[PDB]
Write a protein that binds this ligand. Structure first.
Ligand code: FES
Ligand SMILES: [Mg+2]
Ligand SMILES: [Mg+2]
Ligand SMILES: [Mg+2]
Ligand SMILES: [Mg+2]
Ligand SMILES: [Mg+2]
Ligand SMILES: [Mg+2]
Ligand SMILES: [Mg+2]
Lengths: 168, 86, 115, 109, 295
RNA sequence: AAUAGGUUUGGUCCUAGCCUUUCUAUUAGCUCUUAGUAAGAUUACACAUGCAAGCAUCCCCGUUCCAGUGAGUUCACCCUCUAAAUCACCACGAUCAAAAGGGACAAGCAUCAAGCACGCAGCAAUGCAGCUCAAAACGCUUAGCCUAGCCACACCCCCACGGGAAACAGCAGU
């Protein structure tokens, strides 16, 4: 089967399930954690489970991990203005850590909805073009209109091959 | 059924099968209850429960066996050694 | 593709099949190909009358105004389309062609009466 | 605030100090493998202008993008030494620590 | 001073929702569409109750009554008369504003006639063009032949009134002449054939009740509600009829006699019900059944 | 490779290769009634001939576009800065988009494992001796690409003052 433990982590569905989309201020996130000790357990899980999802939702935010550098696990976010945010993640669970970082540095649902609406405005239903960009290619696909000559031949009076013959 | 003559083998096999009947549990009398992924010896069989009208998108032998059982809708992928008896 | 000079223009990119014209109102470089790359599609125009005997024209008026404010020029067919829509005054050539057609039909009527 | 450098703030590890007033830092970013769908560390080498020559090989340093590159390869400057090698000060408590043990107890103050 | 209630009023909405009723089996009747293998969840009694409550909320959302709108006034407005263009073009032009962030009822759709008249597009042309340039799922540019009288009768014979109403809602605007005509014809066929139970637990029950109340033909619906032991619904229907006809014989009788509950129905059966004797007989039969069940 | 199938052997089981079945494209054989639409040298080898850029009260503007080819090939995308161009004229700006700077960016070969100056500091003089690389540097071979279209080339010498020589990779054609 799929290799490793918890192979669901290596699926696009799991990666897209993340809810933390950092604001444009956040640039770097240093995750310091200990590989042993009960109190850091949640932090460990946060590295094991939630770190991929975050990086998937935030492809440009650098994430750098550190093991057994400090007696306590913590996260440090570096913002574009030079401000640093220290989140002490000791005794917390990974779900609690995700909720905390979403609250303090994650975009809210309203901002995501506004971004999605701005993206949706780019695709206009009335535009005609390739299926990659537009719903319909030609106006002939609209009922009532004159259909495509490749499907319904046009009347001889509507084809130049006979207009020129009649005029000449 | 193993025999010198083909008709004798047919008779032996079909008469001996009815003394070895499994009862296959079916969901709503048209499919299996859940996806069944198993490996018998060197043959992997992966069966997916499917809604009504999906049909038997299974190996031809599995299609035959499912028609015999009374399973109408199921998907099945056979991997590894495609051995009829296994 | 960087071009020397040029400017944005609102024009009709011909589409459809043979004997089945269908124009798309687009904003694009005048140096760009007629059916090539366009900055934005501003509408459509089906010259062939449909079942209801209409020539459907669709105009993204907001974006047309935005591009005209951005300095985009206009081709004569597009100006005539907007004049017919009432978005611009009737083009002088539309009125002049109407007057020429009136003169031609009056001359035909006079010749028929004289016959 | 406007700068001609792509990466504005990057945290990395110094791997070289053999250039005058310049520190060679290795910055690792998680990159998703398109097939395996697993994040692996991809590392890139940056040069940070260390005016005071305070960088030591093996410490974790934060680099800020210069408004313009000052050399062919130098585009960043040492904004901070986040984790001095062998002299890590626990940001949560402010006390010195050697690995996972406090050299000085937080209860001291 | 005293304004007669509208369809979207809170009291009217509550009465119509109560009369509509909720039937999760009917509301979530299995859909004949591309099926997928169902997912199974292990639930306690509390979890099952919460899931049922969520289904009830979703069904209430699904049953939200479409508003009842008056027939739209025909559009006859000329923006310009350019006699110079008279006879130049043999075919009229239709211009549609396709700006994305505009409500469809505020879009400027104009028509340049061969006579040079630049006029605002009619309602039918407006709907046609909006569908052409902003297509909506379930709507057809050309009117489907299902809405002809013969095909509507064919659907009625098969008891597909709800399907007819869904097709009408998709194809036509709520204020459309065709929408209004098809809805009224469906309600009339239901009244004639006594098929009021088809529209129960659907969002079209409120419209049907409103249509019957406004034209004073709630006799059959009241009879069916009494027969099906929905006397609460019958009483609410009588109250709504009285509210929407305060200056009527039934309302005056109820006021003077202080009638409530079943008596209200009797009052209506005596005063304004055309099938008053039939309603009295049905109510007497129901009361006899109630007496037998009590004893 | 899949709902799989044939094929090793006296026979069975397993592993495994090969082929079949399906869908396209080109060419060939045999055959072929009409209508509509779409598409259409193998070749960056050489080209006969005819046309493909004029307009306009003279100046100017255009012929730098469109059209073509795929030889070459991480000049295409994002960000910063800001030329030329349009908005008559400044737009005290908007749109569009060069050069420059940063980042990202094809395949095969490691029997291509070292490149050989590929770095830094200083205003400068000059000083330090570094820089890239098995997480694939350097090199060889193949290939137009990520297709509303984009990149590159325009007979060759990557360029084109110059030289070779007299150019259809514009259309029709040979
Ligand atoms: S593709 Fe629209 S007319 Fe043929
Ligand atoms: Mg070639
Ligand atoms: Mg060799
Ligand atoms: Mg090539
Ligand atoms: Mg040549
Ligand atoms: Mg050259
Ligand atoms: Mg040619
Ligand atoms: Mg030849």
């Amino acid at each position: 089967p799929m290799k490793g433990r918890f192979p669901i982590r290596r699926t696009l569905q799991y990666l897209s399930q993340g809810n933390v989309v950092f604001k444009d201020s956040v640039k770097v996130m240093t995750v310091n954690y200990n590989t042993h000790g009960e109190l850091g357990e949640g932090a460990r899980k946060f590295v094991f489970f939630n770190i991929p999802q975050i990086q998937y939702k935030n492809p440009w935010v650098q994430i750098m991990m550190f093991k057994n550098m400090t007696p306590s696990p913590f996260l440090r976010f570096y913002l574009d203005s030079g401000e640093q945010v220290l989140v002490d993640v000791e005794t917390k669970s990974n779900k609690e850590i995700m909720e905390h970082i979403r609250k303090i540095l994650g975009k809210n649902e309203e901002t995501l909805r506004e971004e999605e609406e701005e993206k949706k405005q780019l695709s206009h239903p009335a535009n005609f073009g390739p299926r990659k960009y537009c719903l319909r290619e030609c106006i002939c696909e609209v009922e009532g209109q004159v259909p495509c000559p490749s499907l319904v031949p046009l009347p001889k009076e509507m084809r130049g091959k006979y207009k020129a013959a009649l005029k000449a | 059924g193993k025999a010198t003559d083909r008709m004798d083998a047919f008779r032996k096999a079909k008469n001996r099968a009815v003394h070895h009947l499994h009862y296959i549990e079916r969901y709503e009398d048209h499919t299996i209850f859940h996806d069944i992924s198993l490996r018998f010896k060197r043959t992997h069989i992966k069966m997916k429960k499917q809604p009504k009208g999906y049909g038997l998108r299974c190996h031809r032998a599995i299609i035959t066996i499912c028609r015999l059982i009374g399973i109408k809708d199921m998907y099945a992928k056979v991997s590894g050694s495609i051995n009829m008896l296994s | 593709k960087a071009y020397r000079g040029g400017h944005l223009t609102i024009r009709l990119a011909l589409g459809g099949c043979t004997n089945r014209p269908f124009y798309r109102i687009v904003a694009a470089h005048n140096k760009c190909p007629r059916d090539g790359r366009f900055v934005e599609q501003l509408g459509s125009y089906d010259p062939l009358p449909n079942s209801h005997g209409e020539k459907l024209v669709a105009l993204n008026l907001d974006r047309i105004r935005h591009w005209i404010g951005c300095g985009a020029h206009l081709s004569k067919p597009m100006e005539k389309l907007l004049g017919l829509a009432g978005f611009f005054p009737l083009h002088p050539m539309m009125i002049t062609n109407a007057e020429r057609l009136r003169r031609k039909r009056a001359r035909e009527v006079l010749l028929a009466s004289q016959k | 605030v406007r700068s001609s450098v792509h990466a504005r703030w990057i945290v990395g590890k110094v791997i070289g100090t053999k250039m005058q007033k310049t520190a060679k830092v290795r910055v690792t970013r998680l990159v998703l493998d398109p097939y395996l769908l697993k994040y692996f560390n991809k590392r890139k080498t940056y040069f940070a202008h260390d005016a005071l020559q305070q960088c030591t090989v093996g410490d974790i340093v934060l680099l800020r993008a210069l408004p313009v590159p000052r050399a062919k390869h130098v585009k960043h400057e040492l904004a901070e030494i986040v984790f001095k090698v062998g002299k890590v000060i626990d940001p949560v408590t402010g006390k010195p620590c050697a690995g996972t043990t406090y050299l000085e107890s937080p209860l001291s103050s | 001073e005293t304004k007669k209630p509208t369809f979207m009023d809170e009291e009217v909405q509550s009465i119509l929702t109560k009369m509509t009723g909720l039937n999760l089996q009917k509301t979530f009747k299995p859909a004949i569409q591309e099926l997928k293998p169902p997912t199974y969840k292990l639930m306690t009694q509390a979890q099952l109750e919460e899931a049922t409550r969520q289904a009830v909320e979703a069904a209430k959302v699904r049953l939200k009554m479409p508003p009842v709108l008056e027939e739209r006034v025909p559009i006859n407005d000329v923006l310009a008369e350019d006699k110079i263009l008279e006879g130049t073009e043999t075919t009229k032009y239709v211009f549609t504003d396709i700006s994305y962030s505009i409500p469809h009822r505020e879009r400027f759709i104009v028509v340049r006639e061969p006579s040079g008249t630049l006029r605002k597009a009619s309602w039918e042309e407006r709907d046609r063009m909006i569908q052409v340039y902003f297509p909506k799922e379930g709507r057809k540019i050309l009117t489907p032949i299902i809405f002809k009288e013969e095909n509507l009768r064919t659907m009625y014979s098969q008891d597909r009134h709800v399907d007819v109403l869904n097709l009408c809602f998709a194809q036509f605007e709520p204020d459309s002449t065709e929408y209004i005509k098809v809805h009224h014809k469906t309600y009339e066929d239901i009244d004639k054939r006594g098929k009021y139970d088809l529209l129960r637990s659907t969002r079209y029950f409120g419209g049907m009740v409103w249509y019957f109340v406004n034209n004073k033909k709630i006799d059959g619906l009241l009879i069916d509600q009494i027969q099906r032991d929905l006397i609460d619904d019958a009483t609410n229907l009588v109250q709504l009829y009285h509210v929407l006809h305060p200056d009527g014989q039934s309302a005056q009788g109820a006021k003077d006699q202080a009638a409530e509950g079943i008596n209200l129905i009797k009052v209506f059966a005596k005063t304004e019900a055309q099938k008053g004797a039939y309603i009295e007989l049905t109510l007497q039969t129901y009361q006899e059944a109630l007496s037998r069940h009590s004893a």
